[PDB]
Amino acid sequence: DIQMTQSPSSLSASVGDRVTITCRASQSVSSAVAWYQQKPGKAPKLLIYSASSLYSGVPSRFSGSRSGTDFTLTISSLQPEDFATYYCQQGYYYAYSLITFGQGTKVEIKRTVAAPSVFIFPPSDSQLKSGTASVVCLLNNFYPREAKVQWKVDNALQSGNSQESVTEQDSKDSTYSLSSTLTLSKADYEKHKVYACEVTHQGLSSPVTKSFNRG
C-alpha cells in the first residue's frame, strides 16, 4: 500500500518567511498528488491538484512541485492567517484506486516573544453551594505557546488535578491565551487558605505568581 510521509510534523515561521512542506510517496505515484489547508475543526480547502496546478480561490503565494516521489508545498511569503494543518493526498481517478492522506504538517506563526499577563479567579459562591471548587488561572496574549503553570495550595505543589486550554493563535498578532483550571472537592478546597498560580515563560524575567486567600 502507498504511504505519503509528510515532514516536518510541525513548524514555526515568521510573517514574510518562505515555508517548504515535504510529502514523500513510498513508491512512484506519478504527479497524482493534491495539497489541502485545514483550519482547526473546519472543512479542508483544496490548494493544489495534479502536484503543481493552483485550484480556484487560492492566493499566488501557494505553489506545488514534484521531484520523483518527493512532493513540495511552498508558501513564498507566509501571512499571519496561514496557521493551519496542511495535508498532501495521493489518488488516481481509476475505479477502486486507494486514497492516501499524509499525516499533516501544523504551521505556527513565529513572532517576537510576548510575556503573558496573569490573573487568578477563586471559585464562585454559587459553585461552592453546588458542591465543587474550580480555581482558574488566565495567561493572556503571550508568545511562544510553551508555558509552565504550577498550582500551589498552602505552598504544596499540585499534580494531576489541573487541565489547560489554549486559544487559536490571534489572526492579527499571532499571540495565545491559556487557561489552567484546578479542580478540588469542596471538602479539599475548604481545608487550605493560600491558592497560587505560578507561571514560567520565556517572556518572564522570573516566574509570576498570582494568589488569593480563601476568604
Binding site: 506519478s30 504527479s31 497524482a32 498528488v33 493534491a34 489541502y36 485545514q38 475543526g41 473546519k42 472543512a43 479542508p44 480547502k45 483544496l46 491538484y49 495534479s50 502536484a51 496546478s53 485550484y55 494543518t85 495535508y87 493526498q89 489518488g91 488516481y92 481517478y93 481509476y94 475505479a95 477502486y96 484506486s97 486507494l98 486514497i99 492516501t100 492522506f101 499524509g102 499525516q103 499533516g104 499577563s117 490573573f119 487568578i120 479567579f121 477563586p122 471559585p123 464562585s124 454559587s126 459553585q127 453546588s130 465543587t132 474550580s134 482558574v136 488566565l138 493572556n140 487541565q163 489547560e164 486550554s165 489554549v166 486559544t167 491565551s177 487557561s179 483550571t181 479542580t183 488569593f212
Partner: protein
C-alpha cells in the same frame, strides 16, 4: 453554485446506528466520487468510504469495513453513510467531499461543513455557568461553563455587543467525561462600577440558554 450540505450528526449509544446525509447541489453526483472523511479528537484526517454512483463502485477503510455502508439516491442528488455497530473510536467530525479530476489524478475539490458524531453512553446534560469575578487600569472577568455533554456550547458577551479582549477557550473533556470551558474578557477597571457584563451561554444539545451577570 456547487455545495455539499451534511446532516444526521449527533449523540449515539455504543453499538448503535446513525445515518449521515450529504446533499449535493450545482452538479450531478452520478459522475463524481462522493467521499466520507472523518477527524477524531487530536487526530489527522482519516478517509472512511467512497461511492461512484453511476457504476455503484464502493470503497471502505479497513477500520469501518463491514460496519459502514455508503449509498446514493441520484433522484435526491444525495449520498449517505449508514454507520452500524458504532464504537468510541468512531467519535469524530464527519465530512463528505466530492472527488474530481482534470487528467486522471483524484482531488477533493468541494467539502461539506462537517457534522459531529459522538459515540457514548453519557447523558445529554446542560452546563452550570459560574462567574469568574474581577479582582493597573484593566480587569479580567469571565464565565466558567462547566459539566455539559455533548459538544458544543457558544458564549457571547452583552448579547454580542462586547467583543474587544474576549477569549473563549476550546472545550476540555474533564476526567469525569463532561466538558467544561471558560470565556474571559479584559475591560477598563473604571467601567466595573457602571458597565454591566453578562455572558450569554447556549448549549443547543440540551436546549440550555443561560445569561450570567458577572459582578466584582
Amino acid at each position: 453554485e456547487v455545495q455539499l450540505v451534511e446532516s444526521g450528526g449527533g449523540l449515539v449509544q455504543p453499538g448503535g446506528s446513525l445515518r449521515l446525509s450529504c446533499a449535493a447541489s450545482g452538479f450531478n453526483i452520478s459522475y463524481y466520487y462522493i467521499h466520507w472523511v472523518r477527524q477524531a479528537p487530536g487526530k489527522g484526517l482519516e478517509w472512511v468510504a467512497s461511492i461512484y454512483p453511476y457504476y455503484g463502485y464502493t470503497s471502505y477503510a479497513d477500520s469501518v469495513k463491514g460496519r459502514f455502508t455508503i449509498s446514493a439516491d441520484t433522484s435526491k442528488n444525495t449520498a449517505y453513510l449508514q454507520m452500524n455497530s458504532l464504537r468510541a473510536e468512531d467519535t469524530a467530525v464527519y465530512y463528505c467531499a466530492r472527488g474530481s479530476s482534470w487528467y486522471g489524478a483524484h482531488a477533493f475539490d468541494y467539502w461539506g461543513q462537517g457534522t459531529l458524531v459522538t459515540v457514548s453512553s453519557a447523558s445529554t446534560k446542560g452546563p452550570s455557568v459560574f462567574p469568574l469575578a474581577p479582582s493597573g487600569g484593566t480587569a479580567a472577568l469571565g464565565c466558567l461553563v462547566k459539566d455539559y455533554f455533548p459538544e458544543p456550547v457558544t458564549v457571547s458577551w452583552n448579547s454580542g455587543a462586547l467583543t474587544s479582549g474576549v477569549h473563549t477557550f476550546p472545550a476540555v473533556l474533564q476526567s469525569s467525561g463532561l466538558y467544561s470551558l471558560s470565556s474571559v474578557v479584559t475591560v477598563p477597571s473604571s467601567s466595573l462600577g457602571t458597565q454591566t457584563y453578562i455572558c450569554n451561554v447556549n448549549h443547543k444539545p440540551s436546549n440550555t440558554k443561560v445569561d450570567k451577570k458577572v459582578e466584582p
